[model samples]
Structure formats: structure tokens, C-alpha cells
Target: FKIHAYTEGGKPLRTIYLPKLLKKVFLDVVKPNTKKNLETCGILCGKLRQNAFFITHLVIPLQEATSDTCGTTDEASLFEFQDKHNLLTLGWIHTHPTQTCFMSSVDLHTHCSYQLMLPEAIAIVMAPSKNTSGIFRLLDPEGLQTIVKCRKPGLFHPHEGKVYTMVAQPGHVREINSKLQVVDLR
Candidate 1:
């Protein structure tokens, strides 16, 4: 079944504007880890205004990472900071220092919650080796349905059908060159 951008009530979703410079600043902060062939992750925090969303903060949480995966170590601290700043969990960003830019099954599950919370939520993947990056979102009903019902557990589990697609022009996420506040709790 095809899904439209409108809500169940038929209200169109608001666009999410992300800063074009966020990835550069994020890569700069996680440089040490990237150089070590380990992954580093960041959270995109922002606020809503005039019915649209704008990413204003890039928060690097204390995390543990291996060659392929990254996990936040203290979500309590993460939530505490967000609450303090009145920020929304708009999306997430991570570096694939050794691989190409794409979401693994684990990433799909990780971002499922965010998209479920806000339909316009996004996932940004940075692959430094290829000097490449991608912005993505679940394909609404199809991707969301398959992922949500998935019972598989483990990092590299296989999923059925098309699970996600790159977010594109006239899409929900927009890149703007603007001011951004970076918070590193690592």
C-alpha cells in the first residue's frame, strides 16, 4: 500500500530543516574515533516553530563503539540534557569510518522509534572513507510496517522488502548553512 505524507487526519507534515554544516562539525568532534577505525554517533536535537522544525544542536553522547557499531552508554544523561534544553529528538547521525553510507538492520530498528515518534524524523549516515553521506527515512507504511513487526534480534539480521529510502528534494529534511550549537558529552 502507498502512504501519503499527510497524517491520519490528513494534515501535511511540516518540513525539517537541518544545517548543512552539521556533518562537518560532527566529523570534527569525532575525529579521534574516526581515525581509530571506530564509529561515532550523534543526536540531532531541535525545536519546532511556525509548524516547521529546525535542527539547532548536535549532541555527541558518551558512547562505546567498535569497527562497525556505536551505542550510547548513558541515555539518562542524554535525556536529562535534552529536557534541560527543551529539545526534541529530531534524528540521529553516525559515522561509517570503514564502510559505505547506509543503514544496517540495527540502524533501521534504532531509527524506527524516532520515526514513530515524529513522522518527519531522519537518519544521517556519514561515510568518511568515500567522502559520502546520506539522509534517510523509513518508507512510511511499508518500511515502518515491516520493521515494526520484525522479531529478529541481533545486529545484522535480514529484513524483507524495501525497508528505507534516501530522503530527497521537496522532502521533509532540508539542509541550510546556518548557526549550530554542538554539545559533546563524551
Candidate 2:
């Protein structure tokens, strides 16, 4: 199911979509191997009943390591998969075992790089400790280094097997929060 958008403060608008299958897949595949490296693949499918929302699929290739290996071959694998699948290469999704939902400096840089080509794309991070999640978007005009937290409504609250849709605006984006709050991209 998907989320609907709603307006809050003028600073940020929200459009939340509950990726049930995605969450399940992440928990099954990603959550198991937080301390070490692992790889998994899946397809992202959804529909936007309201506006003409563009769908861009991404395949995240991650390397779970003891030390930080950001901007390495693992990062390139996402692009390679996009090229192979002929997808738009939207963005990336990674896991943080005991970390918070907020984007780290490394994650911000990674998002900035992809934002250049896919401004509408998003960066997703999962935290196993708090069972929290974060969705990030570039706030800069050039889609450079600006990264902000998105407001979300609730977490994994399924009603009649349907997901909710948070509201969004022109320049802003929306994502699901760890608590399942529909959040606006700042």
C-alpha cells in the first residue's frame, strides 16, 4: 500500500508511502547481517494514484564491513545494476546496525552525488537498534551537499492491508519515518 500527502508547516510538505514488501525484504535480508557484508536484490513497484508520480527503481549494492568503505566499488554496483536493468538509478538504501535514523556525513555525501543526476530520488537508511528509519533528500538547488531529515507519520501501521499516503509539494519530497510518520523533505 502507499501513503497520501498532507500539508503541515510551510517549511516542509509530506507524502508518505509504506513499503511493506520492501521493509520485509530488508528485515529478512539486511537486518540479519548487520556486522558483516551481504548482498540482496529485489524490485520496487508502486503506483501514484493522485499525481503523475515518476517511478525510479534502484538496486543497492552494499558492503557490510567493520570499517567505513564509502565511495568504493560497492557504491558503483548500484549504478551498474541500474544500467543493466535499464532503470533510472533512483538512489540508495543502506543499514546502520546500532545507529540512528539520521543520515551520517558519509551518507550525506553519497546522497549528494546521486542527487545530481536524480534530484527527485531519495536516500534511505535503516537502523536496527531503534527499529527506526530515515529518508533523505537534497535541499540545495544544485542537489549538492544539502541533506535533511524527512518527517514521517507512523511506522508499519497497516489498516485493512492498505498503506497511507503522505502529502508532498513541488520542490519538497516525502518519506516514511521509523515511527511511520509521514515526513516532509526539508
Candidate 3:
């Protein structure tokens, strides 16, 4: 369901919803690696529900991760897995593995394709070592588009026009477990 974000200086931010169960799966996979400096990345897939999207599947694409990054070198394999599962490319999830959750300069560039595919797409980060996690989306309409035009590389400061990244504030954002069951062995 669509929910409005809390105002920042009387201005409302864009919205994206995530389910608790799917988030649990994301955390379960990444948290254990918190003790180590190993990064993990995956794709988020889901369909519309109540006029908005909720993640239905968290697909860990085949990738080699370093202490600071996770990259899916095989885009074909990643997309193939998505087709097999019939999932929309809602966004992506990646872990800091040890550091706090915040988008690096590399993350800004990495998420461009996802935002290009869907404006509402987001980048979720889980930092088990810091005990911090948050879902971040392009500032909407302008932010992602601006990045596309700049075409910068590596880490950089936020563009002057508008805030390019924002964290999901409570109430306007929430989590829930889906009731759908795939097989009833009855």
C-alpha cells in the first residue's frame, strides 16, 4: 500500500514499502557475516499489492564480494534467475558486512540501472556490526535522473540541486509478513 513520508521542512519525501518476512530473509543472510568483512548483494523482486510494491523474493545473484563491495558480473544470469522466478526488478540489497549502512560513491553508480528500470527502486543496506539498517531510495523524479546526467565515478558529494538519498522514516514506512503460502501438503 502507498504511504506518504514524513515532512522534511514541510516537504514530503517519496515512498517505498517493504515486508517484514522478506527483510528477515535479507538480514538472516547478511548478519552472520557481520563478524567478517565479507560483502553480500542480491536483487529484490515483487509485484504490486494495494497499489504499491512489497518485496516477495530476495534473490542473491551469483557475485564475488570483497570487504567493501559486492558485484554481479553476470547480468544475464541474474536476469535469467529473475525470469525463472517471475519477479519484478523492484530494487537491490547489499551489506556493509561490518561498517554502518550508508551508500558509498560506488553505490550511487551501482543503483543507477535499478532506478532507471523503476523510479521507486531502492537500495537496502544492513550493517550488522553497527547494528544499523535502512532502506534508501533515490530522492525521486530528480535525484536518480540527475545522477544519470552527471555520469560520475567513485565516491562523490551530493549534487546541489536536491538531496539524492533519504532514509525511510517510521510510520510512513513499515514491515509486514505475507500470508501467501506456495504449497499446502494437505
Candidate 4:
């Protein structure tokens, strides 16, 4: 399973599996530092194949992060780097450090940018310290209808009724174990 879109009313249709190699590398690079707690982020990159999206790579841009938030430092350089690779900016991925996983208002705004560009874009949150994480996409229509027109900044907690998203499947995450395929360029 590469990627999926809902059937109707923004229900879960299927699973979208990110490449195992990408996760392996991301975990290796972003492993928690026991001495410190901070949020970090990266971009999801890849192409759509066979009607689903396969995450082939991740781009950790030059960033400035706080214990609770993350932001880019060099936008021009990051864009140039990604442009050279020509990979689709599918969405974003970030860590919540010791906290549980859920989108903050800032995260919602950030995701809005990407989701607006591509309806299939998603946001992935990892809480390594708590062993909790989630992958989410804006539930079409409702989220699109609401967030796009919203301009709130900082923390704004929406009632669960005001929010719309699906957590989809977790077991479908494809593990590119040994002998599946290997291609590296660095």
C-alpha cells in the first residue's frame, strides 16, 4: 500500500504506506536525545504510483526548533535543494518529543499550506518518548471548508466536533525488508 483517498464523507478508504527505509533513516537521524527535548520536522517526498503515493524520501531542512515547536531557517536553500531533486512535496512529518500526538493550531496552519497544494498531502506526528504517533490528512470538505478560511494563529483548540480527520490503518505501513529493493543516492 502506497497511498489512499477516502470513498465519501471523508471516510477511510485504504492505507498509504511510507517506505520502511525512510522510517529507518528518520528514526536513526531523529532519535530522542535523552539530555534534551525538542520538536523537529521534515518534508515528505515522493511520487504517485499506481494511484497511490509512495514516500521515497524525507527532507530535513535547516530549522530552528523549540521544545514545543519547529520552524525552518533557510527557506530558499531548502526549496532549491528540493527543486533539484524534483520530488513531490507530499506533506510534512514532525515529532512531539515527550507529548502525545495531535495537531496544534500551528501545525494545522502549516498543514493547510501543503494540503491546499495537494489534497492528498498529510501530516505525520511522532511522539517517540511516549511511543505514540499518528498520520493524518484533512478530512475533505469539512476541513477544507473550515481550515482554509480560518486565520487563527498559535493555540486554538477546536472542539472534536469542529475537527475532521481519519487515522486510517497502521498495520499497512510497508516494511521494505531485505531483498525488496535498494536504491540510494547521496
Per-model TM against the reference: 0.92, 0.54, 0.76, 0.77
Query: lDDT of each model, Cα atoms only?
Result: 0.87, 0.43, 0.67, 0.66
**Ranking under lDDT, best-scoring first?**
1, 3, 4, 2
Better structure of 1 and 2 per TM-score = 1
Best by lDDT: 1
Q: After superposition, how far is residue 14 of candidate 3 from its true place, in Å?
A: 9.3
Candidate 4 lDDT over residue span 48-119, tens digit each:
678566677777877877777887788787677667867677777888878887887778777877876876
Per-residue lDDT of candidate 3, residues 40-95 (tens digit): 78787777666566666777776777788888877787677667767687888888
Query: What TM-score does structure 4 among the candidates reach?
Result: 0.77
Q: Which has the higher lDDT value, candidate number 3 or candidate number 4?
A: 3
> TM-score of the candidate numbered 3?
0.76
Superposing all C-alpha atoms, what RMSD in Å does each candidate have to the true structure? Answer: 3.5, 12.1, 5.3, 4.3
- Which window of 10 residues has the lowest lDDT sum in candidate 2? 158-167
- Give residue 155's lDDT in candidate 3 (0 to 100): 56
